[PDB]
């Protein structure tokens, strides 16, 4: 946060992209080297660029570093979809803030086309039902951008109650995933003919349905 980075950076594939890192007199301006890290969603950071502009073996020639004045930047040529990640800048610091300092972090978003969600709805487990509890599991993943609307309806009548819905989160393919849970008593599950979880994405709505079918 001491070193300032772009909150967000985008780019289409095959494009050249740049991520800035500007600090004070202490962190970079003093002459201290700059280091860059790559962080894929849900994973630990990778040493990407060290000592301003050097690449550790395992990093593509597509990546390059640069330093001038109080700024440092990361260059990516031939942008791949693989590159979508979180980027962090590093520099030694002489200020009250401690010796090692990190930047705010940058959301590098490589272009993706529209992606309709894959929705799978599960009825309450029979084992679960034995426990006098009953939940419906609505699961929509592989979609882009990260925005969806979840509707629950007993038969043809929608009811916004007992609903626990998550926030989209991207997977290794950089497409989002979201899960919704409906908490009922087993008798409510039984009472109605059928339950339907419908998700609305890109003006197209997918309406999967389940019903009390024992087997």
């Amino acid at each position: 946060s001491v070193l300032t980075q772009p909150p967000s950076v985008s780019g289409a594939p095959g494009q050249r992209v740049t991520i800035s890192c500007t600090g004070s007199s202490s962190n970079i301006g003093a002459g201290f080297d700059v280091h860059w890290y790559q962080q894929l969603p849900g994973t630990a950071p990778k040493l990407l660029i060290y000592d301003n502009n050097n690449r550790p073996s395992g990093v593509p020639d597509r990546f390059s570093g640069s330093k001038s004045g109080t700024s440092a930047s990361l260059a990516i040529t031939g942008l791949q979809a693989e590159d979508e990640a979180d980027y962090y800048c590093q520099s030694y610091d002489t200020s009250l803030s401690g010796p090692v300092v990190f930047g705010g972090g940058t959301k590098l978003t490589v272009l993706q086309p529209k992606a309709a969600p894959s929705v799978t709805l599960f009825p309450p487990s029979s084992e679960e039902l034995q426990a006098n509890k009953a939940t419906l599991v609505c699961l929509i993943s592989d979609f882009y951008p990260g925005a969806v609307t979840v509707a629950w309806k007993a038969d043809s009548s929608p009811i916004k109650a007992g609903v626990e819905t998550t926030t989209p989160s991207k997977q290794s393919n950089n497409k989002y995933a979201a899960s919704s849970y409906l908490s009922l008593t087993p008798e409510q599950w039984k009472s109605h003919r059928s339950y339907s979880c419908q998700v609305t994405h890109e003006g197209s709505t997918v309406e999967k349905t389940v019903a009390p079918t024992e087997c």
Binding site: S25, S26, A30, G31, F32, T94, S95, L96
Partner: protein
Amino acid sequence: VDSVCSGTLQKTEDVHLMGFTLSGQKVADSPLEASKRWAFRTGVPPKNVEYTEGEEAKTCYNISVTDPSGKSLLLDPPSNIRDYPKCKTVHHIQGQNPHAQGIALHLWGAFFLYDRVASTTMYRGKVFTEGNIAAMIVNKTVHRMIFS
């Protein structure tokens, strides 16, 4: 006038020793550059000398350096060592040296400047700037106009 008699010194108070910085002598003062002028050595006894006024410092350093075992390679500051009076930017540095012995001695023969005290060595944890000092005669009247 070029004469030995030119100049008058009425009180000792009128002797002024001014500390001028190396930054004021257009010398690179970045921590990585500045440190190239500092070095460790044994067999030399650190000396200190009092001065009276000094230049506002561009940059200063607040440094602690030890040996790997954690024991400081820099001398503990004497009662009379205070942080340099006016620093625009202080560079706080704390670390260790793998294979160094003795005390920190300035290479150029310049002094480590603190608050009204110049030294041949670097004191642990005290704010300093690099510089040299010069002696001159300033009467109170002249002194009053400048500082006010």
